[PDB]
Amino acid sequence: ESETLNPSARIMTFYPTMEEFRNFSRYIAYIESQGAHRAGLAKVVPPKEWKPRASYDDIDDLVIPAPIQQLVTGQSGLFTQYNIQKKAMTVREFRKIANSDKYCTPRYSEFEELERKYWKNLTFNPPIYGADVNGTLYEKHVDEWNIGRLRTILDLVEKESGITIEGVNTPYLYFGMWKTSFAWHTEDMDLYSINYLHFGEPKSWYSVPPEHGKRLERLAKGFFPGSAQSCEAFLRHKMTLISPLMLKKYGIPFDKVTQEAGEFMITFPYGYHAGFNHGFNCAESTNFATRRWIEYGKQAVLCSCRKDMVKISMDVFVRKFQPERYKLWKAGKDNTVIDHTLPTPEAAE
Ligand SMILES: O=C(O)c1ccnc(CNCc2ccccc2)c1
Ligand code: NI
Numbered sequence: 001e002s003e004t005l006n007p008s009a010r011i012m013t014f015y016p017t018m019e020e021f022r023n024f025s026r027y028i029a030y031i032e033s034q035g036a037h038r039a040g041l042a043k044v045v046p047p048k049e050w051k052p053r054a055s056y057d058d059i060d061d062l063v064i065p066a067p068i069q070q071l072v073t074g075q076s077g078l079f080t081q082y083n084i085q086k087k088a089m090t091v092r093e094f095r096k097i098a099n100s101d102k103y104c105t106p107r108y109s110e111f112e113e114l115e116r117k118y119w120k121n122l123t124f125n126p127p128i129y130g131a132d133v134n135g136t137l138y139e140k141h142v143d144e145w146n147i148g149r150l151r152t153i154l155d156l157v158e159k160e161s162g163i164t165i166e167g168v169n170t171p172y173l174y175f176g177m178w179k180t181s182f183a184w185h186t187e188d189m190d191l192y193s194i195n196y197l198h199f200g201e202p203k204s205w206y207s208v209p210p211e212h213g214k215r216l217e218r219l220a221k222g223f224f225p226g227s228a229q230s231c232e233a234f235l236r237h238k239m240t241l242i243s244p245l246m247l248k249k250y251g252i253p254f255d256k257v258t259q260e261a262g263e264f265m266i267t268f269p270y271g272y273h274a275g276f277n278h279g280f281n282c283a284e285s286t287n288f289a290t291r292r293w294i295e296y297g298k299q300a301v302l303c304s305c306r307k308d309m310v311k312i313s314m315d316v317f318v319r320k321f322q323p324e325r326y327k328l329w330k331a332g333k334d335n336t337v338i339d340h341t342l343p344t345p346e347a348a349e
């Protein structure tokens, strides 16, 4: 039934009306009813009338506290990315750097050419990324798809324990320039994520279907055996870059899509993804959940080599939504096998 919906597991694109757009969790359930989740990543173009902010003219004075210089080492489509933290800077200082001749986007015709240039020049002229900035650019009154307050069941973490994890249950802003990258990863606890590109140049994405995520992990383990040896989930370090040609060469299925200003990207549980920015831009993102996430959360293999990493207690979720399984789960005897094709039960509605 669900296995015959989006059988190719290709990135789908949706165009909600304003009526459909008003209810966030309902539209996520809807796009899962269409098999969007099988790709691991989906685009949602909001209705033309909608805007999350009047204008972006008043933000040049906003501080980027921990900008990162991205140094990349490698060859043959396999790279490791090292972060160098730089001194704080404003958006204006960042924009001047980004649009300067040294760091700006090279000339091209089609995306294919720019993509070839990215993979060719990845290790040269290391760019600076204004990443992981706490904040939102949504105006206080906007109620539709507000990244600061989506109001999904992930709110059970703050409600229960009081804990906020920066980026996870709070919003983060991302100021890109040309050739800034996000490495291959799933979300913390294999959650969903939502990314909105506020303005500027495009952001391109790669995605591997959740039903082939394990194929990618095996490949990564083969190429980085030392990293695998010292961490059970080293891809969560967000340092590993793998070109589409390497994926194609080892038979890993994947898709690509370019995100444009004013468009949303949703990543789904266990949806590995990576990409880069075309030029100067600004993106906002956070994690969220559905009832279907819970099982992914229970089975998520976490980073074992760093004390300061994101761990969510799954108790509250199992207790509330799977009371019949809670005694079995605490005993370490819950052998539920995840079927990556099933939509979230809210999609009945
Ligand atoms: O640089 C990017 O555009 C980018 C793209 C895709 N994923 C990330 C990081 N995982 C999403 C996330 C962001 C912020 C808070 C919590 C989760 C970043
Ligand atoms: Ni992500």
Ligand SMILES: [Zn+2]
Residues within 6 Å of the ligand: 230, 231, 232, 233, 234, 237, 303, 304, 305, 306
């Ligand atoms: Zn680790």
